[PDB]
Design a protein around this ligand. Structure first.
Ligand SMILES: [Zn+2]
Ligand SMILES: [Zn+2]
Lengths: 645, 98, 65, 147
RNA sequence: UUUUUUUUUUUUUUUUUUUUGCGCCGACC
DNA sequence: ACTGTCTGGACTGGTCGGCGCTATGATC
DNA sequence: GATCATATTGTCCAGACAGT
């Protein structure tokens, strides 16, 4: 297609040289994804204060990234020494990396606030005295394998990443601010159903795909496990390569499971806009899904190299940051409160033409982990909302008495010397349970160790890596105070099977948080097998148990369960332990929460689309909203296109 | 400049170095150059005064392995190796001149 | 780069076409044909396939794309 | 004259043909014509009255190995000079292999064939869901022919 | 003043525990 | 039926240690 | 200045065999 990126770049350069003083020495101006990069020979005059950069960003309506000229670059050892001397010793810098190709130094520090500065003046001071553009990322207190691998992949593929970013920036700004003639919303999946979500945003200029996911419940049937690839609009977009970007709401298999499949068969080549916690958690979940599919004997959906390609094609966006991802579409992300890095996708199509907010999975009540979902937007016309708990009789129990019952059950179990086994998801409810247990044990209620097995430790490390995405209480504790709730010594990690055997054989009371809520794999099955005959122990279920799983069999009240032994003979598990079920820790919004979010959203949307739930639940939610507030509501099926404007 | 830039000394240097290091001379010859024996003063002189034969060690060369009457004053009559090298690996006499 | 004419299938290194003076040259071509004699058998075979080919000895292309 | 084969290095037939043509032009070799199809790898066709002229032309070039001792009938190389689309000769329903493109080393089934745009639509056989893709005709290679 | 088409309900989770080879040379029994 | 000729093969076991050797030319 | 296809095709004993 025809592009006018060169004319836009020339106009931007003319505006810059009109505004920026001549002593700066501007050499090259280019686009790197959704941000503008300016190369100068005198960084001292360019950024003596933040007012000039702020004025340039306000005038150009772009994210300005000032970088020094590659010709004026200090030696890496002298640059490292100068950076270490300039940064205060309170901020413990761990790793410093340099990019010879483009002026940029990556600084890994335990306290990025001191490296950045009170108002960013420390970054300007560093890039002035050292002539190296600084990029600061947080070193987690708990080491994370996924984050280290992602950072190593990004650093080792700098040339490919820069080429991809330049191509994305050229494609995004192919033309200036364009008013779309029409806006179309089509659902390739997740409409009147749970899982395999897929939302396509179509205009006359650009196309946007939102939370491309997969279905695990119907994995046996290919017609229901994956989004509708037979849609004529999706086929036209993929065949012609017109997909501008893909945005993932949050890191779950029903929202990001099908992402590596596109890169496996080279069906996509553009960028992916997720928050860094969402990217890390979705990479971990995709790797676990691939490993599980491999272990089950079925053909894996994709390969780890496809996940690496997804990592290489991912652009990280923070909360509240407005970026241009299309000639007519502006994308910003807001907190959702469901899981770590969960974002509500807000799309600003045109210059005030229309606004779409896709909430996805979200929570509107305050929690121990994350702040409630953002209900305030600069402009809102169409709202897309989940309907997982959209039924009239769907009313989840409040959090405080559920956690009180959990605490009292755990205390009763530990009073008699038993062991508490809590099967849980890899992300979500497990971290909330750990936070509740840490709060209870901080007053001296319990002294027994808490053991995390499987992906719980990795998810905890990822949570520690991004404390700004957590709730206000945890943020205040970590930043204002010196206390980190996740760094409690009670939380212990078991390395191998020998440590698990020692934990099981030990007579001292302990709390074990496994990584399989249904007891279908992982260390949860072994823990249940080795702790079931003991009557002093107890098992607490914090999630719904699907039919046909071992966890549902234990929850229903089966005293004995026949299983296949190691030698090939049937084995009988005597479940003499206590069984408890507390389903009050669900991260999904309640029906009352959904109604409150509809009532308290500002501004009031013109129409509301109910998706991500069962068909009768979605219809009930839409009818209730229409009857209570008078807003027009629709619950379309799959392959349904709605013309918003 | 055109002639000078077209000459690569590395090929000749590497060929000579490899032949002198491995001992494999061009034409199928092997064992031409060996590591100098530094066990004592006698071994180095004996190796520097060593004469070998191109015949195969496994074949019995009865007419070639035995001491010849023309070896008087040219080839040492007593210093010979044991085994397959007996009579085929010789040493120069102290009065010998080449 | 070497580009081939869309009319006479002639590969030239300049904008001007020394055979028909065409301004539309293609940078993608396969099966290079070198003609040194006009009365060659393969030149005669190419003449009945493409009328404008093999008029002047030189480089030629079987197809233009 | 007579068609002769010259064995050359694979992937560098065009440069060897150009060098042979330049040498024949400069030194007035009795060479009639040179044909170097792109599909044939490592071999070129030179038309000369006798194989001695070919041997004298190709000598002195490191990349010209030897001349095949035989004469090719013109009917064998007649189809090379004719211009035919790469899409033509392909029918839907068979299995093809994609030599080049983003789908390198992948087997696919032909779905739609159109000779107007010189493109062929294929469906990957290893994909869990059918996703038709458009690829160039010359990029594919016919593995089997069924329907 | 005119021929030859047909028609309806049963398969569940958003995921899991240690340099091989090649050849040469010298030497011992 | 004899007789000289062509071709294939195996070349005593073990042990000691050393000394090299395992890419290159042509675009982009 | 970095990468990519290609990179060539020692005597003697015993059994089988043309020659007269
Ligand atoms: Zn979801
Ligand atoms: Zn022409």
């Amino acid at each position: 297609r025809e592009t006018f990126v060169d004319d836009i770049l020339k106009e931007i350069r003319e505006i810059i040289v009109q505004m920026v003083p001549r002593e700066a020495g501007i050499t090259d101006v280019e686009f790197e994804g959704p941000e503008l990069v300016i190369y100068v020979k005198n960084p001292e005059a360019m950024m003596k204060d933040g007012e000039l950069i702020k004025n340039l960003a306000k005038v150009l309506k772009k994210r300005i990234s000032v970088r020094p000229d590659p010709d004026i670059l200090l030696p890496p050892e002298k640059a490292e020494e100068l950076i270490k001397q300039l940064v205060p010793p309170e901020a413990e810098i761990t790793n410093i990396s340099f990019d010879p190709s483009v002026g940029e130094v990556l600084i890994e520090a335990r306290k990025p606030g001191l490296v950045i500065g009170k108002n960013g003046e420390t970054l300007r001071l560093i890039t002035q005295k050292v002539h190296w553009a600084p990029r600061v990322v947080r070193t987690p207190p708990i080491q994370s394998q996924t984050i280290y691998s992602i950072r190593s992949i990004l650093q080792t593929e700098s040339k490919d990443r820069r080429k991809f970013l330049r191509q994305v920036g050229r494609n995004i700004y192919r033309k200036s601010e364009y008013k779309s003639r029409w806006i179309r919303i089509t659902g390739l999946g997740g409409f009147r159903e749970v899982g395999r979500s897929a939302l396509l945003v179509q205009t006359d200029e650009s196309y946007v795909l939102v939370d491309f996911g997969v279905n695990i419940a119907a994995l046996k049937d290919p017609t229901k496990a994956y989004p509708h690839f037979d849609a004529p609009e999706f086929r036209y977009v993929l065949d012609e390569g017109l997909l501008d970007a893909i945005i993932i709401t949050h890191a779950a298999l029903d929202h990001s499971g099908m992402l590596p499949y596109l890169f496996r068969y080279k069906l996509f080549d553009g960028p992916i806009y997720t928050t860094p916690p969402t990217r890390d958690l979705m990479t971990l979940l995709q790797q676990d899904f691939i490993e599980i599919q491999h272990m089950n004997g079925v053909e894996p959906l994709y390969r780890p190299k496809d996940i690496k390609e997804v990592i290489k094609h991912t652009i990280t966006l923070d909360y509240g940051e407005v970026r241009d991802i299309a000639p007519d579409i502006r994308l910003t992300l807001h907190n959702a409160g469901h899981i770590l890095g969960s974002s509500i996708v807000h799309l600003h199509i045109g210059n005030g033409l229309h606004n779409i907010a896709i909430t996805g999975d979200f929570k509107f009540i305050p929690t121990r982990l994350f702040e409630p979902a953002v209900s305030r937007f600069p402009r809102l016309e169409t709202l897309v909302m989940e309907s997982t708990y959209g039924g009239s009789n769907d009313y989840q129990m409040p959090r405080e008495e559920a956690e009180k019952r959990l605490i009292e059950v755990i205390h009763q179990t530990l009073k008699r010397g038993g062991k508490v086994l809590i099967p849980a998801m890899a992300v979500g409810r497990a971290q909330e349970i750990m936070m509740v247990l840490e709060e209870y044990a901080r007053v001296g209620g319990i002294e027994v160790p808490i053991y995390l097995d499987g992906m719980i430790w990795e998810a905890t490390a990822i949570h520690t890596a991004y404390p700004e995405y957590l709730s206000k209480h945890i943020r205040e504790q970590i930043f204002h105070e010196g206390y980190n709730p996740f760094l409690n010594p009670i939380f212990k990690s078991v390395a191998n099977s020998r440590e698990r055997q020692d934990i099981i054989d030990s007579g001292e009371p302990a709390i074990i948080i496994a990584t399989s809520g249904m007891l279908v794999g992982g260390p949860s099955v072994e823990y249940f097998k080795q702790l079931a005959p003991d009557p002093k122990n107890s098992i607490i279920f914090v999630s719904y148990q699907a039919e046909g799983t071992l966890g549902r069999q234990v929850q229903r009240g089966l005293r004995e369960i026949p299983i296949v032994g190691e030698d090939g003979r049937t084995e009988v598990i005597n479940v003499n332990m206590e069984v408890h079920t507390i389903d009050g820790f669900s991260g999904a919004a309640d029906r009352r929460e959904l109604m409150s979010y509809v009532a308290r959203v500002r501004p009031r949307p013109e129409r509301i689309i109910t998706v991500h739930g069962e068909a009768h639940k979605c219809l009930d939610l839409s009818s209730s909203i229409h009857k209570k507030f008078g807003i027009s509501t629709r619950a379309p099926n799959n392959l349904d296109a709605i013309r918003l404007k | 400049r055109f002639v000078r830039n077209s000459i690569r000394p590395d090929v000749l240097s590497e060929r000579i170095e490899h032949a002198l290091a491995t001992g494999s001379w061009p034409g199928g010859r092997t064992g031409v150059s060996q590591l100098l024996d530094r066990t004592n003063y006698m071994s180095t002189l004996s190796h520097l005064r060593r004469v070998t034969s191109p015949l195969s060690r496994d074949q019995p060369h009865f007419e070639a392995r035995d001491l010849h009457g023309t070896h008087w004053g040219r080839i040492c009559p007593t210093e010979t190796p044991e085994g397959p090298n007996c009579g085929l690996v010789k040493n120069l006499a102290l009065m010998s001149q080449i | 780069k070497e580009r081939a004419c869309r009319h006479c299938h002639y590969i030239t290194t300049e904008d001007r076409c020394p055979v028909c003076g065409s301004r539309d040259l293609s940078d993608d071509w396969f099966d290079l044909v070198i003609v040194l004699d006009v009365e060659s058998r393969i030149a005669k075979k190419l003449r009945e396939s493409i009328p404008e080919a093999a008029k002047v000895p030189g480089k030629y292309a079987i197809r233009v794309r | 004259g007579k068609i002769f084969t010259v064995s050359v290095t694979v992937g560098q037939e065009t440069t060897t043909a150009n060098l042979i043509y330049s040498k024949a032009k400069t030194y007035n070799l009795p060479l009639y014509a040179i044909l170097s199809p792109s599909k044939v790898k490592g071999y070129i066709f030179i038309e000369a009255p006798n194989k001695s002229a070919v041997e004298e032309a190709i000598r002195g070039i490191r990349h010209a190995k030897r001349v095949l001792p035989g004469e090719i009938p013109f009917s064998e190389i007649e189809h090379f000079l004719e211009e035919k689309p790469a899409v033509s000769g392909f029918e839907p329903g068979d299995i093809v292999e994609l030599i080049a493109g983003p789908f390198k080393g992948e087997k696919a089934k032909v779905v739609r064939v159109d000779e107007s745009k010189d493109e062929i639509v294929v469906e990957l056989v290893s994909s869990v869901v059918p996703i038709p893709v458009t690829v160039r005709g010359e990029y594919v290679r016919l593995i089997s022919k069924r329907q």
